[PDB]
Design a binder for this molecule. Structure first.
Ligand SMILES: Nc1nc2c(ncn2[C@@H]2O[C@H](COP(=O)(O)OP(=O)(O)OP(=O)(O)O)[C@@H](O)[C@H]2O)c(=O)[nH]1
Ligand SMILES: Nc1nc2c(ncn2[C@@H]2O[C@H](COP(=O)(O)OP(=O)(O)OP(=O)(O)O)[C@@H](O)[C@H]2O)c(=O)[nH]1
Ligand SMILES: Nc1nc2c(ncn2[C@@H]2O[C@H](COP(=O)(O)OP(=O)(O)O)[C@@H](O)[C@H]2O)c(=O)[nH]1
Ligand SMILES: Nc1nc2c(ncn2[C@@H]2O[C@H](COP(=O)(O)OP(=O)(O)O)[C@@H](O)[C@H]2O)c(=O)[nH]1
Ligand SMILES: [Mg+2]
Ligand SMILES: [Mg+2]
Lengths: 430, 86, 430, 430, 430
């Protein structure tokens, strides 16, 4: 019951999913052949959340994979746990977008999306009670940031009451791999605010910083960043698949973390994270988890959370632990940092406990906090956008496929209005 | 030969009847099968620490999926590129 | 399901095509007979049983080079009737190969192009090679580009033209046809890469330590650059780049698409292994002005956008840590309206070595394609050379008597003046 | 009991039968020597449907093979399972028709047909309870499309209450192998509508499209097209030879799929179909079967089924599965696609379950749907016919053997009337 | 049980018959002595024990060529008394071989034809070879055709006539007897194929690279064309074609049965294996106007119907994919009243090579027989040549004195005018 379907688009989203599904399968004891080989009874009670049942007793994820080029899905199939995905759900084009948002949203993405919407509708109509959808995509690419966001609007138009999740990677100015990143980032943020019920920003720069400083491993690769993102993704829905002292589905988090409908851009972090050589030194206790949870360097975004004030915060503890300690520590982390918490909403931290810890760990915490410090990312994105747009650089590529500069002006104005009205509440006082 | 299809696998059953032509698939696939493991084995690994990013426990090998009957042929094959980019 | 077709016209074009086609056959394990003793599909096609046929066509009016090709070791590889050959050479006269003898040959080439294109299903685009300072090369390249631009339309075409050196020259009349061909391909080619011989001679002398190089050594380096550019289409990589993802990242405006390339490392086996060849040092060497593949000084102008490809065991974090260092340096400055200008690609396959060649085997390499404002100097010096002889109308009778009109020389001069004014207008800060 | 006899004519029909009988024999475990070597008891209980019993314990098919030339039957005898056919049933002429419909229907086919009708009468009078006849022939050939259709009328005149099946291959304009295809196609469709109780159109173009796109095999041959057609043919009568939850003979399908006596032209499709490399990825479930079953590219005809509305549909599931899932999935495939189903007949999908799956597969589905989209094939056939007939091209060959243009005019008018009255119900509303 | 009889009359006919009869004996493994050291039955007959006898008859009034045949290596093969020979040559006079000396020889030839026909049981038809520009050839061919048309009636006869070149000629009086023989065979032969020498000379020069060809090289190519045409009767194939299946597919109207042929590939072993010889490129080469086997330009007229034969390992889907490409091209246009014009045949046996010959061994080949509206030019130029000398009644006394009437020349002119008017009337669109 109350299950969700997985939809991913683009190369970055496909690579994120290729590790997210591996993590989920390892958590539920599903072999790469789709056969259950788990140890505990609880591993099968709520498997309908992510997995479907077919004849022969094997399980198949309800994931939908889409891209405008076939290479990435032809590569993910040969990887581990690549056989679980149903071949029918693979939809792709023969041309690609070339990191051009217009091509992936107006000319090419519009004709292809009917086929993927057909299978999306097939998956949603069938399921017992829908909880919602979760979306993984990147804002630094053309086909992803175009087709995914248009699909968001199409899904929202047909299921207005369901919940919608988006895990979005925004292009940081530090590690830049594409010159046209500001254009399709700014165009995508315009559409994303209007339809997504929840959005979670993730930055490659913050992932590299975490890998270099906390784990202290010499050579980070995309596999480590994907593993961290996958652990963070799994931590959110853990209590929906396992029993606990205070169950809290996604809708309950939506109620408690979004004060106003347009303020739904969160930054997350996962604890504990320790190096291989120091994993024996540390002792896992609730104070040790909560001190690392609110650490500024532990956030999955380069945004500095002590440059603003938290509107609200959430924590999803895992493992068996006493609730009194959790509540007193949450109170203590809020009394010692009163300057960084907005004062006109008292008791702005939500807590939840799940009795099933991750495989290999005795305690774990997932942190989701809505803070005013996120304005800095939109500020720098808009700064680069307005630095590049004033000369009409690279504009002809977009304008040759039916798009105009008016949609750029409206997007810039709406993004600046969002930036302004997000900080409006930072200076608000009672 | 008008009524025998071009290849050993009839589309309905997508499977083979034993003889060499049938045997090549039950053979080439063993080869072709092996090649796929190595890049996928490789792609996550060069990027990977080998040790979990948070726990730090030593990682596990990907060797389990391929059946052990062909376990050794895969053995030498992985090393040939191991030396090439050694 | 991704394909590309390469066009070779003229003596220089055929001699660099031979150079790239040993390298591709060696890299995909195909013997010179065409027989192997799923990545080949980008450049080759399967015949059903046995041999592979290149997706390439060789053009020339002068039969000597084609006859040399049809008797060498590669006689069995190419299809016998795609090596189109003429009888009479254009003899460095541009008007000949555009108005007199090229027209009767161009129809067969277009028929061959159609017959090759109907086989491909996912055609990415065309590649063309031609030495500009010759009659048949420049004239037939212009005519083929003009026919293809209307037969196919929006398909992408890439041109690896070899402009004459600043002072070193083999002919005496090459500025005329160089200017005319630049006129022709200015409005007809999506990408043009600079390849003059003097810079590559200096590269060989300084790094490879060869004091008596021949054309083969130059063509091998060009072939390596081509292989590095197209590796991302036929090998698995952490950060892929497609051909169609260029005009959205390197071409700010439709007129400006001339850029100059560089490659690193270039080193011989006698002293290669004594140093570690880290990613930082190779990416520093790639940006050195003395390692430009065209004899132009980047210190004399701004950068617009840099697209640079890696291959081997490089890790993205090391790439970011090196892009930061380059942004730090005061001798390299980017244009004002471009905050980020780097597009990064990472591939896993190390560069392949050709036996008996110059380059050694290494695990890391970098190839950069950079668009800069300093390129206007070659246009200015070619224009100055053209004006000196056009003042007295020298050598014009060799062109007027081959069907070309008198006024055709002036409008090419006007288009070059327009291009030079445009390059100055773009490079000024706001 | 309730068995049927097999009659085939022409080269195409003989090649179809040469694989249909191989598939049936492999299903029932009959060796090419006629000796049973099966494993299950059910393999022999209903073997009287297709096979007769002779002394010595061997089995012989009740098939009748006819052609106007001896080559094809002299070739099919040397193939595998060619010895099963009784030599007495082989009837042939010494002249042939030369793809001329008049010769195979008026002059040569009329004199020969007495001998084949003698053996047909011998076979039908003897059998326990007749169910009916099934006919395989091609509409693109002269002798087939003439003699088969005249034999249809002769059989119908003597057995008006029995059921009659015809699997007819119509000439597509894409892959054309004969210039006189429209004439004998149009002449044959005229007679086929008046006498056949059921007709199933099959196109070589659709078979090539399926083989190239779904199975993704490099080199299709006639053996693969024949194998697909044979699997589709066997799927229809499976529940008549094996037990099941809801048995449904051919007459029950005739009742439920033909609303009006002149609308009996169906297009079929078989599922599942997967490539060799992806046969391990996929998991066989009822949703996976039903999503591929209604796929437009899976139809055995080039007709596009989303260009019209289904009058009715049928599905014959194979294997052991739950009926509740089948019914709910059939309801879901009809609620999500209400626009493509005619509204004045509710619940227009028939389902059946057979507990015996095909050898090597755990689940299989045969789809038979009566749709209004079939009009496009007759439209293009009539278009080519009227383009060729207006100049009286190739007309003298037909008119030299007693035929006239009046029979061409009547055939064209009746075919156009069929086209019109078939779409009349597409625009009909309640 | 399928047979065909070939008739060879005249010096050119006998010299091409020798050429085809080395090839058939080589292809069926029969030694020149006639002894083997069930496909032979089409051309040969079994004598009960040992040798095989060809189903061919050689005719000539001039004894030199027959005497050369009866002393060569093939003296033991042919039956001694089917090499009918005369004493006095007709000496390029048509009236001689139709009225004076041919009548006394024609009875023996007809007796031999009857004696050969009574042996055959499944006689498909007759083949006849004759060079048109000679007295005995044209005259005896006309007389034999006229006798056979009434002795047998509806049996099919095929004529491989060799018309004179546009400007190259060996005689001076050949237009007269060419026109008269065209008159005679216009109403008496079912198929006539164009074979003028100049086109085949150009083919040899361009492809085979022979600068000094002789008649044997021409006759070997003609023999290869004959073998390709008749391969389908004696070898197993996926798509068979019979001789009687021609007038239903290539002959729109009884008067129009002159068509021109082409063959591909034609290449020498020195450069054959360097290219892959795909089916697409060979089917493109076959349609090239420069590869027509008769010196006529197909670009000057419409196509009516194309019948084209493949042999080797060709797959039907590759054939369809190449027919589509040809339909795409704008330089090849079909007549309005013919939507599809292609008849395709596929055979498995690759073409056989003759030792010491010109052609190399290949696995794929294509032979096309195409009926086009452009053929009227040869009739017009022959008519113009005829009129020039008939205006002054030159060389007429050599014909009037051999029994022919004065008015016989005029009616042939009227029939040619009628044919030219008919070709113009057919080619206009409706
Ligand atoms: N890099 C490089 N450049 C070459 C090579 N061969 C010729 N060139 C350049 O080509 C220019 C002249 O054009 P060519 O390619 O030699 O001759 P063409 O293009 O066939 O024109 P024609 O003279 O009419 O035959 C010279 O100035 C050379 O600089 C080569 O092998 N490598
Ligand atoms: N293709 C081809 N044509 C030939 C050959 N020999 C002769 N011809 C043609 O035949 C024409 C003349 O007819 P011939 O066959 O030589 O002589 P004929 O048919 O026996 O007639 P007579 O002169 O009466 O003996 C010439 O114009 C030649 O073009 C040959 O070997 N091959
Ligand atoms: N975490 C992670 N990020 C990736 C990976 N591959 C690419 N990216 C990021 O995705 C961005 C490029 O997105 P792109 O591939 O063009 O998206 P697309 O246009 O939808 O295919 C780069 O800035 C990378 O930082 C990966 O494997 N893991
Ligand atoms: N599926 C299939 N179709 C065939 C085969 N052989 C021929 N055909 C089709 O049959 C058509 C020609 O029919 P034809 O042989 O003339 O029929 P006939 O006149 O009765 O002998 C062609 O268009 C082919 O597409 C075969 O082996 N399998
Ligand atoms: Mg030259
Ligand atoms: Mg003679």
């Amino acid at each position: 019951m109350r299950e969700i379907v997985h939809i991913q688009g683009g190369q970055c989203g496909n690579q994120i999913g290729a590790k997210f599904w591996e993590v989920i399968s390892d958590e539920h004891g599903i072999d790469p052949t789709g056969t259950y080989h788990g140890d505990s009874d609880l591993q099968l009670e709520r498997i309908n959340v992510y997995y479907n049942e077919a004849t022969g007793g094997r399980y198949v994820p309800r994931a939908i994979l889409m891209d405008l080029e076939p290479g990435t899905m032809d590569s993910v199939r040969a990887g581990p746990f690549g056989q679980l995905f149903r071949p029918d759900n693979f939809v792709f084009g023969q041309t690609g977008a070339g990191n051009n948002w217009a091509k992936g949203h107006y000319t090419e993405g519009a004709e292809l999306i009917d086929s993927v919407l057909d299978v999306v509708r097939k998956e949603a109509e069938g399921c017992d009670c829908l909880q919602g959808f979760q979306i993984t995509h990147s804002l630094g690419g053309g086909t992803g940031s175009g087709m995914g966001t248009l699909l968001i609007s199409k899904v929202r138009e047909e299921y207005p009451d369901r919940i919608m999740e988006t895990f979005s990677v925004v292009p940081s100015p530090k590690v830049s791999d594409t010159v046209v990143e500001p254009y399709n980032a700014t165009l995508s943020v315009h559409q994303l605010v209007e339809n997504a019920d929840e959005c979670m920003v993730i930055d490659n720069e913050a992932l590299y910083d975490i890998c270099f400083r906390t784990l202290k491993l010499t050579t980070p690769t995309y596999g480590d960043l994907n593993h961290l993102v996958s652990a963070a993704m799994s931590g959110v829905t853990c209590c929906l698949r396992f029993p606990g002292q205070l169950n809290s589905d996604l809708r309950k988090l939506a109620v408690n973390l979004i004060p106003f409908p347009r303020l739904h851009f969160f930054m997350i972090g996962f604890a504990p994270l320790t190096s291989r050589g120091s994993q024996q030194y540390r002792a896992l206790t609730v104070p040790e988890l909560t001190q690392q949870m609110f650490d500024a360097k532990n956030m999955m975004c380069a945004a500095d959370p002590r440059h603003g004030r938290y509107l609200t915060a959430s924590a999803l503890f895992r493992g068996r632990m006493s609730t009194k300690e959790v509540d007193e520590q949450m109170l203590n982390v809020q009394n010692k940092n009163s300057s960084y918490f907005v004062e006109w909403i008292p008791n702005n931290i939500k807590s939840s406990i799940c009795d099933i810890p991750p495989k290999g760990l005795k305690m774990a915490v997932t942190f989701v906090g809505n803070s005013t410090a996120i304005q800095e990312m939109f500020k720098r994105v808009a700064e680069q956008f307005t630095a590049m747009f004033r000369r009409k650089a690279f504009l002809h590529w977009y304008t040759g496929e039916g798009m105009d500069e008016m949609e750029f002006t409206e997007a810039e104005s709406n993004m600046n209005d969002l930036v302004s009205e997000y900080q409006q509440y930072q200076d608000a006082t009672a | 030969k008008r009524n025998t299809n071009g290849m050993p696998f009839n589309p309905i059953t997508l499977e083979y009847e034993k003889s060499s032509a049938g045997d090549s698939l039950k053979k080439r696939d063993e080869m072709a099968k092996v090649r796929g493991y190595v890049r996928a084995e490789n792609l996550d690994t060069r990027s990977n620490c080998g040790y979990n990013i948070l726990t730090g426990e030593q990682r596990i090998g990907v060797e389990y999926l391929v059946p052990n009957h062909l376990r050794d042929d895969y053995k030498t094959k992985v090393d040939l590129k191991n030396e090439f980019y050694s | 399901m991704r394909e590309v077709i390469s066009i070779h016209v003229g003596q220089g074009g055929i001699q660099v095509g031979n150079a790239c086609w040993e390298l591709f056959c060696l890299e995909h394990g195909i013997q010179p007979d065409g027989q192997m003793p799923d990545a080949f599909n980008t450049f080759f096609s399967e015949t059903g049983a046995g041999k592979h046929v290149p997706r390439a066509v060789f053009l020339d009016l002068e039969p000597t080079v084609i006859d040399e090709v049809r008797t060498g070791t590669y006689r069995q590889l190419f299809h016998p009737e795609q090596l189109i050959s003429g009888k009479e050479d254009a003899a460095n006269n541009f008007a000949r190969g555009h108005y007199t003898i090229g027209k009767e040959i161009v129809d067969l080439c277009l028929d061959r192009i159609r017959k090759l294109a109907d086989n491909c299903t996912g055609l990415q685009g065309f590649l063309v090679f031609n030495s500009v300072g010759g009659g048949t090369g420049s004239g037939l390249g212009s005519l083929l580009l003009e026919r293809l631009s209307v037969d196919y339309g929006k398909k992408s075409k890439l041109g690896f033209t070899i402009y004459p050196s600043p002072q070193v020259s083999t002919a005496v009349v090459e500025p005329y046809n160089s200017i005319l061909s630049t006129h022709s391909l200015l409005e007809h080619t999506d990408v043009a890469v600079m390849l003059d011989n003097e810079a590559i001679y200096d590269i060989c002398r300084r790094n490879l330590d060869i004091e008596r190089p021949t054309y083969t050594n130059l063509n091998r380096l060009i072939a390596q650059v081509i292989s590095s550019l197209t590796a991302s289409l036929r090998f698995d990589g952490a950060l892929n780049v497609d051909i169609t993802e260029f005009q959205t990242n390197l071409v700010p405006y439709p007129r400006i698409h001339f850029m100059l390339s560089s490659y690193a490392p270039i080193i011989s086996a006698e002293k290669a292994y004594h140093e570690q060849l880290s990613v930082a040092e190779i990416t520093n060497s790639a940006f050195e002005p003395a390692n430009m593949m065209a004899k132009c000084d980047p210190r004399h102008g701004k950068y617009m956008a840099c697209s640079m490809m890696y291959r081997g065991d490089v890790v993205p974090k090391d790439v970011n840590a090196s892009i930061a260092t380059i942004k730090t340096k005061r001798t390299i400055q980017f244009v004002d309206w471009c905050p980020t200008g780097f597009k990064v690609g990472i591939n896993y396959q190390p560069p392949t070595v050709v036996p008996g060649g110059d380059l050694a085997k290494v695990m890391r390499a970098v190839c950069m394609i950079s668009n800069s404002t300093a390129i206007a100097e070659v246009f200015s010096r070619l224009d100055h050379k053209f004006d000196l002889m056009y003042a007295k109308r020298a050598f014009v009778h060799w062109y007027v008597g081959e069907g070309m009109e008198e006024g055709e020389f002036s409008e090419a001069r006007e288009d070059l003046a327009a291009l030079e004014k445009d390059y100055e207008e773009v490079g000024i800060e706001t």
